[PDB]
Structure formats: C-alpha cells, structure tokens
C-alpha cells in the first residue's frame, strides 16, 4: 500500500506502476473506505525533504520512459526529449526550470549582501565558464573602487558592475535585456506579448541546447563503451557480462525482504517473460492482453 | 490530447495520396460516403459528421511495450546503430582466403606469411565480436544509471547550464 | 502465463523508485 502522501503525488503522474497504485486506491475509495486525513504537520525542513523524495519517485520511473533521441538528425527529436522532461517536471511537482533554478539562487544567497559571496555559493548552479567571466569583471570593479561590490542594486558601485556583467551576458550569447524584461514584466498586455515571444525564442533555444548537450554526451559515452568492447575477444565479453549479471543478482538475492529487491527479481522474471513471449511468435512480438 | 476535439468531416482528407490504398469520400451536407480499397478488399460505410466527433471521446493513448524500458531500448538501439557502422567497415575487408593456396604459401617470405595468417585470424576476432549483438543489451545498462542520476537533479529534471546561466542573468542583474 | 496486460507491460523495469522509496521510509521517520 501507499502512505497517502505518495498517492497524492501520483495523481497527476502518468507512469504505469504509479497509476495502478492510484487506480487500486480509487477502487478502495469506491467501496466506502475513508480517505485518511493528510498531515498538517512536518515543519518546513521536513516538508522540503519529503517533497524531494516524493518528486524523485515520479521522476525516476518517468526518466526511464523517455526515449533518448540518440543519433537523430534535427531539432524536433531533441525538442520532444526536452518537452517530455518538462512534463515530467510538472508531473513531479516542479515548476518551470527558469522558476526552479531562480528559486535555487535566492535560497542559497539569502544571507549575502556582497557580490563575491553571491558568485561563490551559486557556484554549483552556473557554468564555471560563466562563473569565471563574472569573477573577472567583479575583480576589476573591486580593483576600481577598492571596496567590495555590494548586492544592493541601488549602490552605484553595483550599477557599473551590472552594466559590465550585462556585457558578459551578451558575450555568452544570453539576451540580458530580453530575460530581464520578461521576469520584470510590463503594464500593457501587448508590449509584454512581444517580449514573451522573444524570451521563449531564447528559452527554447536554451533548453534544446541543454538536451542536445545531454544527448551528445550519451552518444559519446556509448561510442566509447562500444569501442572498448569491440576490442575484446568474444570469450572475454561473455564472461565479463555473466560475472556482472550474476554479481548483480545476488545483490538482489541477499537483500532480505526489501521492497526494491522483490521488485528487482520480479522484473528479471518479467524480462524472461518478454524473451519467452517473443520466442512464441517473433513476427507478432510480445503477447499483450487484448 | 485534450478533452474536446474539433476536427472531423470538415476540411477532411478527401482522397488517398498513395496507390497502395484507394480512398474515396463523397461528402454530402450531413453524412459522407467513404469508399476504401486496400489490396483485394473493399469497404464503404456512411460516416456521419457527428460520428467522427464521437471518435475522439475515448482516447487510444498508445504506449510502448519495452523489454526493459523505453530509455534502455533507445540506448540499445543506438549501440545497434553504432555496431552497424563498424560492421560496414568489416564488410569492406579484402578476401584474404583467396591467398590461402600453396602457390602463395611457397612464394612468400616465411615471416610475411605468418603475418598474413595472423591478419586473417584477427579479422575473425573482430567479426565475431561485432556480431555479438546479445552483448549490446548489457552495454546499454552501463549508460543508464549515470544518466538517470543526472536526471534526479534537485533543481529540475530538464535543467541545464544554458538555462541556469540565463536565469543567473535575471537573478544578478536585478536588485539583490 | 501468456498475454499479461498492457498497463503491466508499460512499467519501466530497472528504475530505482524503490530505493528512493526505501530511503524515504527510513529517513522521514528518522528525521521527524
């Protein structure tokens, strides 16, 4: 059974095993079972923690259901792959990646009033190619007033740093005026419409280039793994893999009664059904219930 | 798909584009005489304008039956696609067995013949491992777990550097 | 044995989801 905070997180989820746990829960609620009162407890740090481990149970089967567009030509397999991960973000409780990483910035730097500390604990989330090209401009402006540039905005010592960091943001390719004029906004709905259509022209060219950089690293890893494997003799390969397969079974067999280990060996039995159902009719495929 | 769909028998396809299947619709104002012809078979029914609108009421929602997962099968299809590019260059290997006769054995230097018999034993090493396609499904499981951990990001599954740098420009070049 | 289902055949197999569930069932009752 599910602990009723999982089943609230699997309602908008769309993978198979989360929906069959929802559907057998909704079948219990048709037979008059009482919906348990969800907890108005678990203060802010615990609520952020169990949300992190409930989103990762919607993300983890969902990532395995998204076909990578490896070896494809064009932008639409990469835009499909990106859009399936957007919808996996929305199904798991994430907001937009712009709204999710900006919340990560302002949470990590809620204590900072100097820019050199803002550029130092937002280090894990920006490029080191971009963290360095802002630390060059920062340590020239701090070599200009010989005082630390403040995270104030109304300080003029920040204003000519932000005017030079805007010149860095174009030096990466980021439209710094377009991004700012979207997350600020405008009064009329017609002049904010023309800035959303050119933010989303950047944003779609942005998230495609992160998906396409993820595909080009899986393509390069798989071509590196294969060429290391094609240089082996066949007798080495079959016993390297049978050693790795058998070691990984006994890690699931020595695990006493754990839910992941029963689900591991239930899926080894379901792979062997797939190989057996294909052997019965190979031009048909596996047998589904129809 | 959404809940309500607004297509059917208006601006519809009137005819087929191939020759493998022959489509003929005859639209009146209310109904339509479709005539389909595929192979030897033929069928012709009457589709109402409010019979195609009930079609998108209960959705099909196709989903892939994979051996392991859709992710793994897309990595394994790429390794099968990469093994084909290596098999195509073992296709262009010169037929060394045309020089196995004893008029090449005895005319040749005894060390250039042992190199030739080693280069023929090497092709059978390369060819018997590029056609070991039952090993590609376990090479795909060496790519999956490191990819799947990058998708378990604490920010977003679809986050990357270009977006997170573009959202630092909004965060830094606004007031504090 | 044959002809399982469709909604049972749509499951991604060797996902984690149950290590993630296991370390959520021994962390949240331990940090509360």
């Amino acid at each position: 059974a599910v602990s009723k905070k999982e089943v609230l997180y699997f309602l908008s989820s769309k993978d198979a095993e989360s929906s069959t746990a929802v559907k057998s829960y909704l079948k219990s609620l048709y037979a008059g079972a009482q919906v348990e009162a969800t907890e108005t407890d678990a203060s802010e740090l615990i609520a952020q923690l169990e949300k992190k481990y409930l989103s990762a149970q919607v993300v983890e089967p969902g990532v395995h259901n998204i076909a990578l567009p490896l070896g494809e030509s064009g932008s639409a397999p990469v835009k499909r792959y990106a859009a399936e991960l957007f919808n996996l973000g929305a199904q798991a409780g994430f907001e937009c990646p712009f709204i999710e990483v900006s919340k990560k910035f302002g949470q990590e730097t809620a204590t900072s009033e100097t820019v050199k500390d803002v550029l130092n604990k937002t280090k894990s989330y920006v490029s080191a190619d971009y963290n360095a090209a802002l630390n060059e401009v920062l340590s020239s402006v701090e070599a200009e007033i010989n005082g630390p540039v403040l995270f104030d905005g109304k300080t003029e010592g920040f204003k000519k740093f932000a005017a030079k960091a805007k010149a860095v943001a174009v030096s990466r390719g980021l439209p710094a005026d377009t991004i700012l004029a979207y997350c600020a906004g405008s009064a009329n709905e017609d002049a904010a419409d023309k800035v959303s259509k050119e933010f989303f022209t950047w944003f779609e060219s942005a998230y495609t280039a992160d998906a396409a950089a993820e595909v080009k690293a899986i393509e390069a890893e798989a071509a590196s793994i294969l060429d290391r494997h094609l240089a082996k003799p066949v007798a080495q390969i079959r016993k390297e893999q049978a050693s790795a397969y058998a070691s990984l079974l006994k890690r699931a067999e020595t695990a006493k009664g754990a839910k992941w280990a029963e689900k591991y060996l239930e899926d080894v039995k379901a792979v062997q059904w797939f190989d057996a159902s294909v052997a019965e009719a190979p031009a048909s495929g596996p047998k589904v219930a129809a | 798909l959404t809940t309500f769909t607004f297509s059917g028998l208006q601006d519809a396809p009137v005819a087929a584009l191939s020759g493998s299947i022959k489509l003929n619709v005859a639209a009146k104002a209310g109904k339509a005489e479709v005539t389909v012809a595929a192979g030897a078979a033929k069928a012709a029914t009457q589709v109402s304008a409010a019979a195609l609108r009930k079609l998108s009421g209960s959705k099909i929602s196709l989903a892939e039956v994979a051996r392991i997962s859709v992710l793994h099968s897309s990595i394994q299809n790429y390794l099968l696609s990469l093994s084909n590019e290596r098999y195509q260059l073992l296709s262009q290997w010169p037929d060394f067995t045309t020089m196995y006769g004893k008029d090449f054995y005895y005319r040749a230097h005894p060390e250039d013949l042992k190199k030739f018999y080693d280069a023929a034993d090497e092709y059978y090493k390369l060819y018997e491992t590029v056609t070991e396609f039952d090993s590609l499904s376990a090479l795909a499981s060496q790519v999956v777990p490191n990819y799947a951990a990058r998708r378990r990001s604490t920010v977003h599954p679809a986050i990357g550097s270009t977006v997170a740098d573009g959202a630092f420009t909004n965060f830094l070049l606004s007031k504090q | 044995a044959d002809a399982k289902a469709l909604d049972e055949l749509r499951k991604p197999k060797f996902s984690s989801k149950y290590l993630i569930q296991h370390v959520s069932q021994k962390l949240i009752p331990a940090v509360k």
Partner: peptide
Amino acid sequence: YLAPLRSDFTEEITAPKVASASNLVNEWNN
C-alpha cells in the same frame, strides 16, 4: 542487462562531460 540501482541526487548543474573519440574506426582502417 540489469543495472546497479542508485538513489542519489545531482546537486550541481554542470556540463555533461562529452567523452573523447575512441580510435577504433582509425584502428580498424589500419
């Protein structure tokens, strides 16, 4: 065909580490 199960998160946001071109098309052409 089966993988080690992992339950850990990615806290950084990095580039995905493109590996190098392995020399096997150029070794098998030699």
